[PDB]
């Protein structure tokens, strides 16, 4: 049947803004996009809403996307927009089940330009990942090159069944680079990420098959906590992203550390 | 009854539809009013994609409701 | 028939299929024995990404041949 | 491999787990080591809930990683 | 005994029910008062979904409790 | 063989490709002629999206087939 979500109200920039919590796995990409819109005050809900349904969440996102009304455009922009919107809506329903992204390991914003990557452009919501190859190490950067995941994963298959020694070596090196970094975040990726995200930016961060809302406060990256388990814990709003192992620091709505509950 | 269909370009159309009308019938009524073929049409209501084989009662589309039209390349 | 489905992690699955089945059928068989979505699946034989519309006979699928299962990066 | 399970009260559980262990097994492993019923238990890694039914290898849980714990509220 | 039910519009409807009544019968009472069909309702209390086959006493429903009501208008 | 790429405006370009060329490679050819970056191009064939990693033969791209170019700012 229908999925229902719980609204957790927090104090973002002195004003009472709502964020929508997550229970079962799936709703992550829609929840990341809308939480970006709720925090930036682009979309807002009546003041005391506690739970919200799936149809309402899609109605809000659909109305905000289709009623943009930008008139200063030529025939190139207009017809490209109507097509970029058409393919965006054929996928838009997937934002509830689960969104697929193709990842390339050379930059924090470098993705394959798919109709799923369009929604983050029509809303001007930057989309980031941290699965970057370490450029100072040569034997991995040669084997992975400028390949994407759907390309590298086919590359190691064709490499495994080759007869060349240098080819199976590159295939095994690329396989090991995927097996060692299965958390979809690398040390160099976190370093370049912190540099690329602007201070006060509101974006969506892909990692470990999850879409989470991200910001940068005083040079430090943070992910908003979206789990329903923390819905009633008023002092956990942001988790600091400072390591690859998930040893984040829980902070409150003003990015101050949370005291243990004793 | 009456429902509205809004283009991304601001132009808003009005169709005399029935609550038992199929989305294929609505797409045909948009063709009878503007000439856009039903294959180039994508109909949206409240974030949902209006599918071909359903009707307006399944989506709870009542009087003076507004749907969104997005043009599409020949889908094949 | 009996074919092998090999993940990248080395996990190999056995599946009783027939050369008369479609690739979409095999993806449903893997959904039942693994819980993997049929949308996320990408099968690979001889460098080709096997298409849902075709059948195993069109790909020269033979007995105890192995199909490499790889999965798209899905975020949910 | 060993993994850590920090929580809100400040405690930090350590468990000797394998990638194939199901989510109910790590929940039962917590019931053994620190005495909390998996009935009222709920885990979080990377801001995503680890559902009852999947495995740590299905979530790409690496060695020496840090999980998170909370009380399962829904009945 | 009396129980309160809050709708999305903010209006609270009060009904007269017994603790041994099932959720389907309570949905029929909502159909008699507000006219909504039981095929379009979803009842929520304490962060959980009330099953149609469960009684009020099975969900530990106390007196003067306020349960939320959500609907399935746009199906799919 | 030659394929043709038509933008939504109506401008059709001519390219010399081989069926064993990946779409990422074809995108680089369009960058050579029109100057558009590959990560800003969207190639459509028969109203369906074409992945960067596949080859033309994988999509049954025959001779004189024409593809729709869609842009991204
Ligand atoms: Cl603030
Ligand atoms: Cl982007
Ligand atoms: Na900020």
Residue numbers in the entry:
A (entry chain A): 239 to 500
B (entry chain C), C (entry chain F), E (entry chain D): 1 to 76
D (entry chain E): 1 to 75
F (entry chain B): 1 to 73
The article reads:
To conclusively establish whether the catalytic domain contains five Ub binding sites, we crystallized the catalytic domain of MINDY2 in complex with K48-Ub5. The structure of the complex reveals 5 Ub molecules wrapped around the catalytic domain of MINDY2, resembling a pearl necklace. A closer look at how Ubs bind to the S2′-S3′ sites reveals that they are primarily centered around the I44 patch of Ub. Interaction with Ub at the S2′ site is mediated via V242 and I289 of MINDY2. At the S3′ site, L304 engages with the Il44 patch of Ub and both S324 and D325 interact with R42 via hydrogen bonding and ionic bonding, respectively. In contrast to the other sites, Ub binding at the S4′ site does not involve the I44 patch and is instead primarily mediated by hydrogen bonding between E350 of MINDY2 and the backbone of D52 of Ub, ionic interactions of R342 with D52 of Ub and cation-π stacking between Y351 and R72 of Ub. Mutating key residues at each site on MINDY2 to weaken the interaction with Ub impedes the ability of MINDY2 to cleave pentaUb. Importantly, the SAXS data for the MINDY2C266A:K48-Ub5 complex are in good agreement with the obtained crystal structure, with a χ2 value of 1.48, validating that the conformations observed in the crystal structure and in solution are similar. However, close examination of the MINDY2C266A:K48-Ub5 structure revealed that the K48 residue of Ubdist is solvent exposed, which implies that this Ub does not necessarily have to be the extreme distal moiety in a chain. Furthermore, we observed pentaUb wrapping around MINDY2 like a pearl necklace, in an open conformation where the I44 patches of all Ub moieties, except the most proximal Ubs, engage with the DUB for binding.
